[PDB]
Amino acid sequence: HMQKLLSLPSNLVQSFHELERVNRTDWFCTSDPVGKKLGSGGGTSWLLEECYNEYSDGATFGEWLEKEKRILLHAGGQSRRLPGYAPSGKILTPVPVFRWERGQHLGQNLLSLQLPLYEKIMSLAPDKLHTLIASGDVYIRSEKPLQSIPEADVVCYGLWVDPSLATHHGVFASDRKHPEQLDFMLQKPSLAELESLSKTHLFLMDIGIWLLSDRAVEILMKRSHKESSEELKYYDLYSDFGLALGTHPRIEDEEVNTLSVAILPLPGGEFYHYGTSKELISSTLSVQNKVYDQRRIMHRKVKPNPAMFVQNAVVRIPLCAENADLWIENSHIGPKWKIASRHIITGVPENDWSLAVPAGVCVDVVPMGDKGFVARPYGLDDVFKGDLRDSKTTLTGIPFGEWMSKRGLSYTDLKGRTDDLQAVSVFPMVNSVEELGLVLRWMLSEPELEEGKNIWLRSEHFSADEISAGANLKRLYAQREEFRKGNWKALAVNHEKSVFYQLDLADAAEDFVRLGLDMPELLPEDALQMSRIHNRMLRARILKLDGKDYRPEEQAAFDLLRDGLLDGISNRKSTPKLDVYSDQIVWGRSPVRIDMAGGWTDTPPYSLYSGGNVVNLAIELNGQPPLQVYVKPCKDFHIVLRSIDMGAMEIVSTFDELQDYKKIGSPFSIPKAALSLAGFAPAFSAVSYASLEEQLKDFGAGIEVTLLAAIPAGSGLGTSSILASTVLGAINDFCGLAWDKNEICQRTLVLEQLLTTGGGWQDQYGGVLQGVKLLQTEAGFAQSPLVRWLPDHLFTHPEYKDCHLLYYTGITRTAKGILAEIVSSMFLNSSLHLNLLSEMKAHALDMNEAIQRGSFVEFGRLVGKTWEQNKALDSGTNPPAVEAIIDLIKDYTLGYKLPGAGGGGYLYMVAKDPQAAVRIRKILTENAPNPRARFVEMTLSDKGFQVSRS
Amino acid sequence: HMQKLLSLPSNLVQSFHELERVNRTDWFCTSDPVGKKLGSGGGTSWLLEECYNEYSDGATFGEWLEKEKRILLHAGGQSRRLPGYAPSGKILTPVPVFRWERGQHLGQNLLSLQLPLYEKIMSLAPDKLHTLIASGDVYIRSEKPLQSIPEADVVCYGLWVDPSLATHHGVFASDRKHPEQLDFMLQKPSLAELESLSKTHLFLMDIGIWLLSDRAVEILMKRSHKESSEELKYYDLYSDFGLALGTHPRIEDEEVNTLSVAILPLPGGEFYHYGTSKELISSTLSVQNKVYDQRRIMHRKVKPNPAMFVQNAVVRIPLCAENADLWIENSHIGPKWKIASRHIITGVPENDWSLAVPAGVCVDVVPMGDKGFVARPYGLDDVFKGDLRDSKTTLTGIPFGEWMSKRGLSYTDLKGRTDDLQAVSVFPMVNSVEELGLVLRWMLSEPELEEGKNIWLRSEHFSADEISAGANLKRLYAQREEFRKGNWKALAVNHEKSVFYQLDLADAAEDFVRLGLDMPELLPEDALQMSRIHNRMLRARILKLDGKDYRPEEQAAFDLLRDGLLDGISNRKSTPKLDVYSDQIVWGRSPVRIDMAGGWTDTPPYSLYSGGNVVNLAIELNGQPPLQVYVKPCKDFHIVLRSIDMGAMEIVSTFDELQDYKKIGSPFSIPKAALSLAGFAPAFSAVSYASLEEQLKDFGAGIEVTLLAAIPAGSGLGTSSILASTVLGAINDFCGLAWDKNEICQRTLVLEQLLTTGGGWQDQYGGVLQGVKLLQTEAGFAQSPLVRWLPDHLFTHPEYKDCHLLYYTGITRTAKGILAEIVSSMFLNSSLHLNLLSEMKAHALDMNEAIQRGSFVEFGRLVGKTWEQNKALDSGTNPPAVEAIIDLIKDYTLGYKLPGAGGGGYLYMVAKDPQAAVRIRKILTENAPNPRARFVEMTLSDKGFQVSRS
Numbered sequence A, B: 001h002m003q004k005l006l007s008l009p010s011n012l013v014q015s016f017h018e019l020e021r022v023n024r025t026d027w028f029c030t031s032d033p034v035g036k037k038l039g040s041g042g043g044t045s046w047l048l049e050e051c052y053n054e055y056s057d058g059a060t061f062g063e064w065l066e067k068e069k070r071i072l073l074h075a076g077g078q079s080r081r082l083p084g085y086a087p088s089g090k091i092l093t094p095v096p097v098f099r100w101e102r103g104q105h106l107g108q109n110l111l112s113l114q115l116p117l118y119e120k121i122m123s124l125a126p127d128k129l130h131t132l133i134a135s136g137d138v139y140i141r142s143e144k145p146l147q148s149i150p151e152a153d154v155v156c157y158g159l160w161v162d163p164s165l166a167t168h169h170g171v172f173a174s175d176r177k178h179p180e181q182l183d184f185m186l187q188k189p190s191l192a193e194l195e196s197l198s199k200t201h202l203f204l205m206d207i208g209i210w211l212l213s214d215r216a217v218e219i220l221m222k223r224s225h226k227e228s229s230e231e232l233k234y235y236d237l238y239s240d241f242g243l244a245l246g247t248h249p250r251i252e253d254e255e256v257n258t259l260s261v262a263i264l265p266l267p268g269g270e271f272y273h274y275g276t277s278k279e280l281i282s283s284t285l286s287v288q289n290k291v292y293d294q295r296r297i298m299h300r301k302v303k304p305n306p307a308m309f310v311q312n313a314v315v316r317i318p319l320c321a322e323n324a325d326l327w328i329e330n331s332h333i334g335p336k337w338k339i340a341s342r343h344i345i346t347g348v349p350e351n352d353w354s355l356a357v358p359a360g361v362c363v364d365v366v367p368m369g370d371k372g373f374v375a376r377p378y379g380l381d382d383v384f385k386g387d388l389r390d391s392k393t394t395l396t397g398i399p400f401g402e403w404m405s406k407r408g409l410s411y412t413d414l415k416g417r418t419d420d421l422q423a424v425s426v427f428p429m430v431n432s433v434e435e436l437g438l439v440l441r442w443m444l445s446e447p448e449l450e451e452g453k454n455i456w457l458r459s460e461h462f463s464a465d466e467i468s469a470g471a472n473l474k475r476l477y478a479q480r481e482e483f484r485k486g487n488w489k490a491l492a493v494n495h496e497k498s499v500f501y502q503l504d505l506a507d508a509a510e511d512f513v514r515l516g517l518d519m520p521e522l523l524p525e526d527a528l529q530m531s532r533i534h535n536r537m538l539r540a541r542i543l544k545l546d547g548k549d550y551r552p553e554e555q556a557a558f559d560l561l562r563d564g565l566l567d568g569i570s571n572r573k574s575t576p577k578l579d580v581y582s583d584q585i586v587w588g589r590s591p592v593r594i595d596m597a598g599g600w601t602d603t604p605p606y607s608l609y610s611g612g613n614v615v616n617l618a619i620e621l622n623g624q625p626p627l628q629v630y631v632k633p634c635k636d637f638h639i640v641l642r643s644i645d646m647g648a649m650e651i652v653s654t655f656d657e658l659q660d661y662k663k664i665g666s667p668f669s670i671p672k673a674a675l676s677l678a679g680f681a682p683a684f685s686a687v688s689y690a691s692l693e694e695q696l697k698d699f700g701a702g703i704e705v706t707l708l709a710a711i712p713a714g715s716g717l718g719t720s721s722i723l724a725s726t727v728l729g730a731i732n733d734f735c736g737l738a739w740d741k742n743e744i745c746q747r748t749l750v751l752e753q754l755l756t757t758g759g760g761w762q763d764q765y766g767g768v769l770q771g772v773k774l775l776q777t778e779a780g781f782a783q784s785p786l787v788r789w790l791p792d793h794l795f796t797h798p799e800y801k802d803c804h805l806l807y808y809t810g811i812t813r814t815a816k817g818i819l820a821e822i823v824s825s826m827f828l829n830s831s832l833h834l835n836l837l838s839e840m841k842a843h844a845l846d847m848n849e850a851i852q853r854g855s856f857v858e859f860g861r862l863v864g865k866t867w868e869q870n871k872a873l874d875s876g877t878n879p880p881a882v883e884a885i886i887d888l889i890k891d892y893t894l895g896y897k898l899p900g901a902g903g904g905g906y907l908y909m910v911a912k913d914p915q916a917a918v919r920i921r922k923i924l925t926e927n928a929p930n931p932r933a934r935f936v937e938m939t940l941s942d943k944g945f946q947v948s949r950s
């Protein structure tokens, strides 16, 4: 597991692992020494020092830093501009579920949303960069493939967004002749400053993702201490260390300038700050406004305003269009509340207050002590900095002097600090919800309230620093959890309009079992089919986690899926007519396929969620099409089915026998379903016939179908789907149905839905259509792949053709059918699975690009990456014997993978060059893992499915 | 030229063609009959009836409606909420140049900005839709490719919008299970209705872009008249006709429901209101802040506030950050003015007034009569509706009763109507700028000024309706033109910070010549290179339009372009070494190319503006590579050059002779430049030599280069560039320079820059690289195409191969005039040319898609569309002889085009089928247009440039 190190507030360090439910093995956290601020760089150095002192197994710091890669997040500031989550350190702020996203956790926060990108970047990083540094108050997205990470001492990711937004952050400025290096950094530059440099420089806004080598770490830790030894000091990573980097740095440092700096634009990058109260709402609104298409929005709720976000809360007042810019979290809004706009309500316990909240002021309630509450009303624009007597120092939008004067208070009532509003003990700690409401009314729009002033005088006073230092986070998290327990039922009941069935339902089931909640009730038959499948699978998972019987629920979900996929599978009528002469035989034949990338993304229901991308190609094996079908007229008015590979024969005389797909011991389900779809079953026939015998008498003869699958099913080469398509095409030619290859593949999809195989669509398109292809579908039950052919240069040119090797290993899967687990995880919107499948889609697009550009090396590498993705999706795909075979020859390949679901069988290898291919052949021949392993010659098929007549 | 029909205010109809300088053939305008409103549908029927009565020519209404597609715009309301441009009908409102856009006209208005999208949609529409309907008070953008337009009776464009905004417009509601249909429309639905329909329906905001068939037009016009007679009536297209459409319409209508409705979401659509005074500022601010890319923003100037827009105006006071929401147009702001924020100043003549404008109040001055001015002060929030005695009836932010009382006035001074503020004659018409200023001061923040009241009492009074009805728009446009004449000089001087050199400089040159302005002075050498080229070409165009000598200015612009393209002349040095045996000969050969789509988009400087997209392929002619080069060692230490096609020979003995590219009568400039780039000229040689003879003595021998261009020059098949690349590749093999094909093409670009050809990069990549390719570059001087190969199925498969016909027309022509005209238009940011080139890029992408999908019919159709685009870009591309050749066989083709710049030469035809190809051959053989015309057999080249040794 990637190690996370966090610089947290002192109060949170002791409770982080319990409140966030994370183990101490993968998570280490500490704080700045109480009473001493260290800044960004100083806090990072202190975090590194603490983690080293914790796991110092006797090695020095230098050899310890190399031992593993680490992701360090600094969230140990004061959070002046975000008081609502200052005691949580910003990084633990709950983030609403995106109305366009599937598979998110209901209790997601900024940390859990932002961590995967950091882990991906670190796994892509070179091995000499053992330290990633980031701020936890941002949400960063990358919707395009990451570029190579250079081997510099400092690697900073940047993003050009808007000069107005760049005005508030760090900016990397690079000379127009050299965007590769960093010329200098700028901390919050003005619009005029960026304009004056626009003619000669490019600017990338600093998004707070830095990567440091051991040399840069040494220099930062030397700068974070004093002149002698261990004496710590304040040091800013971005304003002191940052401005000293680049070609022409603003700050001078002999050791910092020697560090090479590399600025990387984040591909498809998006940046959303979460450091101020205004940004808390604006960034969430932007993320919501990334998608507007209602066909891609699973949250079917009409909000009065898009900038209204309610999490872990109970709202007893009606919300209207005038209540814009609203953020309610971990709060209870009583029915007698009166609100306007621009509000941030956090931590408020249950109440029936008659509280009027003016526009622009926010209310925060922090649990303090065992039973007390600290009331912090503040302003959406309050910065909490500066001297109290300055007119610019504001509280709840009002200057602090005016706030004091209007309430009949004097500065003699504030004993303590007076030069910094952050350190002014002005927030009262009450011991009752009634006193809390009274003092909040007094501190807001009722300064004449007698009892409020009395309570404020009786109560102890806390500053924002003291609040963050003494907050009882256990009670805060417990209130949030009780609110979320109520919200689970609320969302499940309101499923037709809520985000319930687009959430990660595995996480939801875990939370249901942990909180002691009952399973959601069964959705009525009138509900959405997808929602019904989600509901049944969630109930099954809850029963499994509880220790009850879940098999019927699971099977019911699968049955709802198969019923859902039926489109024109009932009313698609054909009129088969004997289109050949009496002594003619129809021969159809098809090659198999190898999927290069994007496999699994065509599998329902994920393909229904977002559409699939698959790059694959048709291949003949040992110079022959492995799937073959013969169709001929029969003197008797019945259907004869013969199987060469199974060595069997069967006579179908009635409609009932033709549609008996699950007949015990029959290997003829595929041709039976194919003949049914061709119009020899009543449901698919345009003409009504009394019996199969009468239909065949009107037809002119019976039908004799002989089938050959020269490659057994489960080999991963697409045997079953391609055989179904071959039978369909032979019957198409024999019966004059005039189907084209695309319609044959679609009828194959329908056929496999008749047989309840539950697979995707990639195999039949890969085999029936010639050449190498990219296949893409959109979201929805209607899955009809758009086909884009690719150049076959990398597979047919003499310098490449002999580098594609196919090796039958003689090994079959030792593990069980994990496919069921994968499909059920898809039904539960499992976040890990959905993320991996999305990465597989993007990787299929990258494979398509590599093939288009004619890059053989990149093609082989991406094949290897597809193998890695498949191993990550299924642990049983790579048994140890296959891994030993791989290790025998891995040094001579650009990449390799198993075709299809894998688990053994065939190994596809892309040799580096023809000599490497000869070497691979020699090695695997002289070191056969078993007597059955053998090479199989594969050639790209320029024909696909072929059919001819005698 | 698609015909535009406009329903305008009555006063504007009489002067529209003169004020906007448009011909009466392509522009028709009328108004609703004065005294009766007809609504959207009634106004549409009246506009159609008027245009028919004008251009009937003896046809019936149906056969006239069929003749052509028409774009109808309704801009004929009262414009209560936009008084500053009410007499202009909103649609003629000047709109500031987008700071991120290139090629816009300085005098652009809303009409000129909105027309291109409508014309694009209409040209994409099926031929049965002859009528597009739109409102003139909106600005709509589409930044993603438009989808196919189905063939329905009514086609409506929509946009996914927040429900809160959808509450204020028409809404198309489609069942979630059938988004292809329209279920029903809703006119301004409430939030509760959207809640009730959100669970079962999708809603798209109506953006006001409808397309109607002739039957729908007939029904709309029957509904727009009464029942018995021809008397027109009010009829709403969206509330009456719209609510009667769909599957389950809200309103019942026997004839309207039979119309098929198709709802299309606008890809990448953006909607900007232009109906109220505040929206005038807000939508403009949004459009300005729409683009973020530093590479695409040429106007890099930060004003004190982003919401300050100044057009056609002189401002004598300084503008600061507090002057937000400011719109100054066609106005002179004297130095003694005092303004705040939220202002709209229009039509103010030159003055020295001491006028104080309070925040939120706007000033408008409308020329009236021969020399008079009507002063209309109003409020930014004034709606101009309601009875005068209501407190809500507002004027300049003040209730009208209070405004009357504060100036000692009574309702006995207002003769006329009193129930509608729009019809109250309260605005005085004065006869002098002095009286104008006095009465404006009186009507604003100086109600106690007696002289203002006296002038108001003596002067005639106009209502807003009377202003819009009697306004002297000629004087308004003349004042605007004088202001713009001043602004031209102001912008040209301030070129480093203005939008000057990103404007349409052809329009700018025309305006400079018309207004009698001198050309801008020469930019210093320290200015931006692109800006300097723009400056020189603009001076050249102004001199040419004036009748002076412009050739040196043009040549200087071309030289600045060539110098800008000079890149690696220093950091790409070669060391040629004799790499062949003494008796060995190197033979290089290349096929020609046919560009399928995107030609011209690779030509600088447009390729530098936005990058090029070109789909092209290599072809052999009559089974041979038409470009051939032989290189062999020479006993003498000189260079021998022989030309087979020119039948010539030349001896190069010195560096001076080798670099004499423009030698009189020499056809050897290409091989001389190629040998120079290979390292036989000192500037490109890594080793310094005293003379060419010494370099060749160290080399081991001289060089003998024989060239053959088997296809005559000017054929359009890429002969020159591909021959240059062939020489470069032959010399590369002969000298062991180890260049790859990409480097060969880049050296070809450098060679053509040495020879000052001024072309693009498409030809060399099309010829050197095998197969069919999409080539793409980004913006910037560095033009290095990314190459993506396409499947060659549509060109090599037997059912397609014989449909590609190449016919030498027997016409030759130096296509350098077409090149010069188009390149000079590119230098001037000619709006027509830039728009057409953008469409050519998009069309290249569509061609790439069609080839990927294997669609032969779509491929041929897109070839035809490429021919149409080329004809539209240059009128000289299709001479009448080529057009006559085309007309002989056009009925047997899916498409056709001339390769390259055209002007004659070869005709590429995509026959519908092999029989059609036989027919085309027969027709063109039996009817040869000239003794030289002949068919040439073309075959796709799977080799590209090849080189071998004897």
Ligand SMILES: Nc1nc2c(ncn2[C@@H]2O[C@H](COP(=O)(O)OP(=O)(O)OP(=O)(O)O)[C@@H](O)[C@H]2O)c(=O)[nH]1
Binding pocket: A007, A032, A037, A038, A039, A040, A042, A043, A044, A074, A075, A076, A077, A078, A079, A080, A081, A082, A135, A136, A137, A275
């Ligand atoms: N360990 C530690 N980290 C800090 C300290 N100050 C700031 N940081 C971190 O450095 C990053 C950048 O600083 P800021 O965004 O200004 O931190 P902040 O909490 O917003 O500070 P203020 O709002 O000014 O109170 C933040 O993510 C903080 O987590 C500090 O004193 N100690």
Ligand SMILES: Nc1nc2c(ncn2[C@@H]2O[C@H](COP(=O)(O)OP(=O)(O)OP(=O)(O)O)[C@@H](O)[C@H]2O)c(=O)[nH]1
Binding pocket: A094, A095, A096, A097, A098, A106, A107, A108, A301, A310, A311, A312, A313, A314, A315, A487, A488, A490, A491, A494, A497, A498, A499
């Ligand atoms: N943590 C978290 N809680 C949420 C989120 N969305 C909603 N909630 C909580 O769940 C409760 C129920 O949500 P819904 O079923 O959508 O109800 P609502 O739309 O918020 O309001 P009503 O239906 O009118 O009661 C809300 O009151 C919120 O407190 C979310 O994205 N994240």
Ligand SMILES: Nc1nc2c(ncn2[C@@H]2O[C@H](COP(=O)(O)OP(=O)(O)OP(=O)(O)O)[C@@H](O)[C@H]2O)c(=O)[nH]1
Binding pocket: B007, B032, B037, B038, B039, B040, B043, B044, B074, B075, B076, B077, B078, B079, B080, B081, B082, B089, B090, B135, B136, B137, B275
């Ligand atoms: N031909 C015609 N066009 C109209 C009519 N009414 C409105 N329009 C046009 O349709 C467009 C949309 O209507 P509105 O924006 O509400 O028209 P308007 O002139 O702004 O009306 P007010 O601002 O309320 O005075 C406007 O640009 C008008 O020019 C009409 O009765 N006949």
Ligand SMILES: Nc1nc2c(ncn2[C@@H]2O[C@H](COP(=O)(O)OP(=O)(O)O)[C@@H](O)[C@H]2O)c(=O)[nH]1
Binding pocket: B094, B095, B096, B097, B098, B106, B107, B108, B310, B311, B312, B313, B314, B315, B487, B488, B490, B491, B494, B497, B498, B499
């Ligand atoms: N029509 C039109 N006029 C403009 C535009 N931008 C500027 N102008 C006018 O041109 C004059 C020159 O403006 P500019 O060179 O940018 O100077 P600046 O605006 O003071 O910085 C201004 O006084 C404006 O009145 C525009 O986009 N359209």
